[PDB]
Coordinates of C-alpha atoms and ligand atoms in Angstrom, one line a residue:
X30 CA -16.7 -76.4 66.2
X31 CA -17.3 -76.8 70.2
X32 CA -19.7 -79.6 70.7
X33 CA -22.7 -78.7 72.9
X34 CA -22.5 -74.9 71.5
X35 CA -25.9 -75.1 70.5
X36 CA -27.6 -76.3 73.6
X37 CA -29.9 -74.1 75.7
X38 CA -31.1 -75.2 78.6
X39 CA -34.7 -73.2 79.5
X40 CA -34.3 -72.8 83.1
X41 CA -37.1 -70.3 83.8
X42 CA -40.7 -69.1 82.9
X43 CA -40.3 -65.2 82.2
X44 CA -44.0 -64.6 81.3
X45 CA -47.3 -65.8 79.1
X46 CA -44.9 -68.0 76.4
X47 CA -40.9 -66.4 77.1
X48 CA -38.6 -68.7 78.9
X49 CA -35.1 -67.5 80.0
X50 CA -33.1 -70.1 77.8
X51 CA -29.3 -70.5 79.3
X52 CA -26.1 -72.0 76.9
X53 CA -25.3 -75.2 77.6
X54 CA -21.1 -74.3 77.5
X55 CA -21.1 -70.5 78.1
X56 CA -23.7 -70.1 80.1
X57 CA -24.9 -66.8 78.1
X58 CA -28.4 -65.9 78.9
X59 CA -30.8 -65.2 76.2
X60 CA -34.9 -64.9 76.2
X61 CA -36.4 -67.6 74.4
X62 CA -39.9 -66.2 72.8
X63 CA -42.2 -69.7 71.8
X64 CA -44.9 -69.0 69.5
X65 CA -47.2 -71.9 68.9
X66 CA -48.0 -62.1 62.1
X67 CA -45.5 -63.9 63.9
X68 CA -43.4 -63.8 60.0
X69 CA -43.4 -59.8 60.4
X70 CA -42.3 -59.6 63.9
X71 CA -39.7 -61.7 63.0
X72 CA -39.0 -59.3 59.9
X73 CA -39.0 -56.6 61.5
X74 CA -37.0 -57.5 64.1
X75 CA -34.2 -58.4 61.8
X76 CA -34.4 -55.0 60.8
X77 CA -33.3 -53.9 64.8
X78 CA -29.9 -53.3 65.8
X79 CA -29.7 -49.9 68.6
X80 CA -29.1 -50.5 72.3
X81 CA -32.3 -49.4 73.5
X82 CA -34.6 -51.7 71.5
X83 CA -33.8 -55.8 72.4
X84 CA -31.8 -57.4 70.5
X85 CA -33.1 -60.1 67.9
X86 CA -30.9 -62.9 67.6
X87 CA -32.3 -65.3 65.1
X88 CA -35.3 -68.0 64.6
X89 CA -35.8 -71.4 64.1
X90 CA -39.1 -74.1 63.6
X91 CA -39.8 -76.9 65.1
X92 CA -43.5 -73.9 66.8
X93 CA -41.4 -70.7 66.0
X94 CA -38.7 -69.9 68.5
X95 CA -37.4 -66.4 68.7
X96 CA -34.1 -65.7 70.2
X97 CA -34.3 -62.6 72.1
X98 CA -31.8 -60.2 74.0
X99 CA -31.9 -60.8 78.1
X100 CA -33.2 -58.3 79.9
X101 CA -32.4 -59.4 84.2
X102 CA -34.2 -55.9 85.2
X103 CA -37.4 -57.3 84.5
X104 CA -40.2 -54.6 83.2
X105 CA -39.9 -50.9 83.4
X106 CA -43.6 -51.9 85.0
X107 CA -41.7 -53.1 88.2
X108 CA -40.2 -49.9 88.8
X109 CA -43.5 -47.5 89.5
X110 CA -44.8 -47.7 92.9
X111 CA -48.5 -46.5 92.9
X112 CA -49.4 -43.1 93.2
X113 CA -45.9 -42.4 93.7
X114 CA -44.1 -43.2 90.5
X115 CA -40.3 -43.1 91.1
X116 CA -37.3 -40.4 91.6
X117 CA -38.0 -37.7 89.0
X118 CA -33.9 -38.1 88.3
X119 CA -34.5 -41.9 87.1
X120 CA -38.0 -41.3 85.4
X121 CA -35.7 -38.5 83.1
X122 CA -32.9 -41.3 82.8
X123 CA -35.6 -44.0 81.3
X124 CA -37.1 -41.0 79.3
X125 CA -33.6 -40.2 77.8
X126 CA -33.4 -43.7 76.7
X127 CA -36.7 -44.0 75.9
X128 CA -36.5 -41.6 73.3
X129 CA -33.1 -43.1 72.2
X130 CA -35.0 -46.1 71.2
X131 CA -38.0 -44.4 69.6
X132 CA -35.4 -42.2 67.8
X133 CA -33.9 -45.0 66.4
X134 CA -37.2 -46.8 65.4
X135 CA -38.6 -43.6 63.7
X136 CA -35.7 -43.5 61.9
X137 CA -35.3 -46.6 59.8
X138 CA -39.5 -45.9 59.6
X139 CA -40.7 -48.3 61.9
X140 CA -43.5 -47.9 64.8
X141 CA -43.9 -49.8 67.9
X142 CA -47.6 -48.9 68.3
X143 CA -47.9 -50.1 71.9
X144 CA -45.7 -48.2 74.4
X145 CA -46.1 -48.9 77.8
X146 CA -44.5 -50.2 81.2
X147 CA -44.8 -53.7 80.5
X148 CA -43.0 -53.1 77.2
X149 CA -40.3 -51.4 78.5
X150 CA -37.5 -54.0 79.8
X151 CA -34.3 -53.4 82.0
X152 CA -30.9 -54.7 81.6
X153 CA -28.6 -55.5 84.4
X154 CA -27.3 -52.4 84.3
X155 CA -31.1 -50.6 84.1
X156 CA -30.7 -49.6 80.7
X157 CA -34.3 -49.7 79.0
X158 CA -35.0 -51.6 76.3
X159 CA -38.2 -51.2 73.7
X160 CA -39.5 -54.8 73.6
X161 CA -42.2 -56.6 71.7
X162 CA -42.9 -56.0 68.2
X163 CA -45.9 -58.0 67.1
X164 CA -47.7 -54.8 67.0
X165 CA -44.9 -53.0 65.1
X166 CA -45.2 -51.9 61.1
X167 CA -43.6 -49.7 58.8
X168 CA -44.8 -46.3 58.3
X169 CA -42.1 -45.3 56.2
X170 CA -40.2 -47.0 52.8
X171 CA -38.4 -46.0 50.4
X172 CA -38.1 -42.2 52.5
X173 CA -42.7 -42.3 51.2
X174 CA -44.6 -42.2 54.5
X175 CA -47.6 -44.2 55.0
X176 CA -50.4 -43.5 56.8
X177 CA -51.8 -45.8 59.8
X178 CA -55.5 -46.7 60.1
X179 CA -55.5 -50.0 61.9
X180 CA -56.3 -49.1 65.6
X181 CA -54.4 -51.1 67.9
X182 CA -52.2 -50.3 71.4
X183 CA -53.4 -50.1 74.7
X184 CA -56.2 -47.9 75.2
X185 CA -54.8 -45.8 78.3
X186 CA -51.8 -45.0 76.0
X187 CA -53.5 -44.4 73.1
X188 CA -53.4 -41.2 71.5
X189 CA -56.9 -39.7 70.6
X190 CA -56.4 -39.3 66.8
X191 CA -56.2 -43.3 66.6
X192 CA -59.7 -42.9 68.3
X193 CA -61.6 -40.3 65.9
X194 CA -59.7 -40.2 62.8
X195 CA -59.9 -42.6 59.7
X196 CA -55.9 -42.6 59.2
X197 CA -53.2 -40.9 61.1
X198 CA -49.2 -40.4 61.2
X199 CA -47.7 -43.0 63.1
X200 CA -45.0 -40.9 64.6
X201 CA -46.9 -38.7 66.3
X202 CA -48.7 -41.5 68.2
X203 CA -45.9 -43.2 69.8
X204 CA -44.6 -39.8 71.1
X205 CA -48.2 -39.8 73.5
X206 CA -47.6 -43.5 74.3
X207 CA -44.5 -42.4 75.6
X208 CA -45.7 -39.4 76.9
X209 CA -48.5 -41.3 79.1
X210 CA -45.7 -43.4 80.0
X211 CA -43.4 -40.6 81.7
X212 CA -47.4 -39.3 83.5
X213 CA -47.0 -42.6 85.1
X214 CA -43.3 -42.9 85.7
X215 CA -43.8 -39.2 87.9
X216 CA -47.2 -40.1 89.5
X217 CA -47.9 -43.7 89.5
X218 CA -51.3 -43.3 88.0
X219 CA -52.8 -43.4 84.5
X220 CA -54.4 -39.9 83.7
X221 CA -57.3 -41.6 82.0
X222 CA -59.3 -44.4 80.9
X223 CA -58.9 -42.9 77.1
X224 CA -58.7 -40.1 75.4
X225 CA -62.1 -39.3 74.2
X226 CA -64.6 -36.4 74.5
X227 CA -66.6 -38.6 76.8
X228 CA -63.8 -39.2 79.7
X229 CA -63.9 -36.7 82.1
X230 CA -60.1 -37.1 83.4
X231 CA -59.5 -36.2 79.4
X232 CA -61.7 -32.7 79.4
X233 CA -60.3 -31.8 82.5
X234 CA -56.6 -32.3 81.0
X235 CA -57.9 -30.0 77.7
X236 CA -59.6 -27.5 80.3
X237 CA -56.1 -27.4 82.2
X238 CA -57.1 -28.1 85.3
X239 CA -53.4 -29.1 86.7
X240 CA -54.5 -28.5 90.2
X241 CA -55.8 -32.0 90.3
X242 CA -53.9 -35.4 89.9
X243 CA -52.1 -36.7 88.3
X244 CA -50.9 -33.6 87.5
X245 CA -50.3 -31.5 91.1
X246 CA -48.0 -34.5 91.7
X247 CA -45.6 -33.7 89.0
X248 CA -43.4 -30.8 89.2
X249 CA -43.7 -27.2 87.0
X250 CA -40.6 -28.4 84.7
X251 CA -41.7 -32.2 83.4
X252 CA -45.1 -30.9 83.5
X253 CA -44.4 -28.0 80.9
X254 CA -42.9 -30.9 78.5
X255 CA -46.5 -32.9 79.0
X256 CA -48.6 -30.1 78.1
X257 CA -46.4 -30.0 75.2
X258 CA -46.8 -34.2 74.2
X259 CA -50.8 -34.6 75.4
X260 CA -51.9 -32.2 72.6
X261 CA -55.0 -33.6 71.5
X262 CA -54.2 -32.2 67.8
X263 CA -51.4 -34.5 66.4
X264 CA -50.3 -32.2 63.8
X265 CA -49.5 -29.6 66.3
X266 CA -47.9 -32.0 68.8
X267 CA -44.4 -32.0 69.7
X268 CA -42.1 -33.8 68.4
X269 CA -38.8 -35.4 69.3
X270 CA -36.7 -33.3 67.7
X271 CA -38.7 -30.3 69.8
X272 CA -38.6 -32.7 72.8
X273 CA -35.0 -32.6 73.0
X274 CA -35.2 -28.8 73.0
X275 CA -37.4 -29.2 76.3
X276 CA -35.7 -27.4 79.4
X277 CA -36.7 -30.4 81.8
X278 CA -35.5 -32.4 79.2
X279 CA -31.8 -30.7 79.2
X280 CA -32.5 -30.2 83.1
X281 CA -29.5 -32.0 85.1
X282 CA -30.9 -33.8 87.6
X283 CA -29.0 -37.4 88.0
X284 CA -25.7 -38.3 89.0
X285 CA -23.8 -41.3 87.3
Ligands
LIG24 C1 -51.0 -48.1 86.1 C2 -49.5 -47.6 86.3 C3 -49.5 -46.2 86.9 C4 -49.0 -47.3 84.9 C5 -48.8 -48.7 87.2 C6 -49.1 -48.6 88.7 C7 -48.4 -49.6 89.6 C8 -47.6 -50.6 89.0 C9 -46.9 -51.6 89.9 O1 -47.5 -52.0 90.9 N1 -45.7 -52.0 89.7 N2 -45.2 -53.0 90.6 C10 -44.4 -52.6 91.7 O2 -44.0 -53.5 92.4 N3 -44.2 -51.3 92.0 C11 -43.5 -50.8 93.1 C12 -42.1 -50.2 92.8 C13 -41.3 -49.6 93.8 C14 -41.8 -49.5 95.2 C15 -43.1 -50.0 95.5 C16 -43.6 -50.0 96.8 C17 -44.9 -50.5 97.2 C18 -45.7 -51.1 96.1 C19 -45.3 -51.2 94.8 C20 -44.0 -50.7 94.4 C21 -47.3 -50.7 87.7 C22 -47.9 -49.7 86.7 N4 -47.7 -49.9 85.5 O3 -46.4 -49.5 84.9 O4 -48.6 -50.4 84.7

């Protein structure tokens, strides 16, 4: 073997802890995540391999230390300017991927349960990347579905079922997260503290009221594909497969 190989030097404080950890010979970049629940995040992330979720390279004790896929574009976060959000072409580009990623999570029955911005991560080449799974759980084994009834996420991205309801589908819960995530990617603002009877900003979303923001910032087409996603009724709430149908999903919009 190559002496040295094993080395990482950590060279840089990526948030609170994650250091940016760099090989000693090859100079490969990887994310260092130092734990001081973290056995199922671990587990689950073992279970990950899709180019839109980071990748998990492996653990070791000394204080667990996950070894985590590099992401030098920072947080999907970075990318909305308030009250503006970003080019409607890029927000559909992140959404595509977005989607990719969830897809693929679905599928081997695992939810994220805390969609947003800040856990949305950029490669060098601005490919997103579904980050951060100590929230994550399976909702599916063995093709039986569980239900959810832990409530946990982020409570402007929660969807309202996890709010008034005992136990819930997990599926249909990460589609809002993501759905409040593409509100803020075309308007730069949050739509609402939560979704419960009591907020206002919720009732006048039910009551269709489009005329005021966020929702007079976003054009006719994406905004047809969030009155489909923001349906307070899970059961009757999109889904992906649907989503993909969407004609501002399909639109073209962004060169290569
Ligand atoms: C609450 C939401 C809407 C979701 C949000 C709002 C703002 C930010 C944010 O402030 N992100 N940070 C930036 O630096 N955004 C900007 C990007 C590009 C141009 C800009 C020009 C001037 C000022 C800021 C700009 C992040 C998020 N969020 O995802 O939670």
């Amino acid at each position: 073997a190559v002496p040295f190989v094993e080395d990482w030097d950590l060279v840089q404080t990526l948030g609170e802890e994650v250091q940016l950890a760099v090989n000693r010979v090859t100079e490969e970049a990887v994310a260092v995540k130092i734990v001081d629940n973290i056995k199922k995040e671990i587990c689950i992330n073992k279970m990950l391999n899709h180019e839109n979720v980071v990748k998990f390279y492996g653990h070791r004790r000394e204080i667990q230390y996950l070894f985590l896929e590099y992401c030098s574009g920072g947080e999907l976060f970075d990318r909305i300017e308030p009250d503006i959000g970003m080019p409607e072409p890029d927000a559909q580009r992140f959404f595509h991927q977005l989607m990719a990623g969830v897809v693929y999570l679905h599928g081997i029955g695992i939810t994220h349960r805390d969609i947003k911005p800040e856990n949305l991560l950029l490669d060098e080449r601005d490919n997103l990347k579904i980050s951060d799974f100590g929230l994550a759980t399976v909702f599916r084994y063995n093709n039986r579905e569980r239900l959810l009834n832990k409530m946990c996420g982020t409570l402007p991205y929660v969807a309202p079922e996890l709010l008034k309801r005992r136990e819930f589908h997990a599926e249909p819960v990460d589609v809002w997260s993501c759905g409040i995530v593409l509100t803020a990617m075309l308007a730069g603002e949050l739509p609402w503290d939560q979704p419960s009877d009591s907020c206002q900003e919720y009732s006048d979303w039910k009551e269709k009221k489009t005329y005021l923001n966020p929702w007079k910032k976003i054009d006719s087409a994406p905004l047809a594909l969030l009155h489909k996603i923001l349906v307070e009724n899970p059961s009757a709430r999109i889904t992906i497969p649907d989503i993909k149908k969407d004609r501002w999903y399909n639109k073209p919009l962004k060169k290569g």
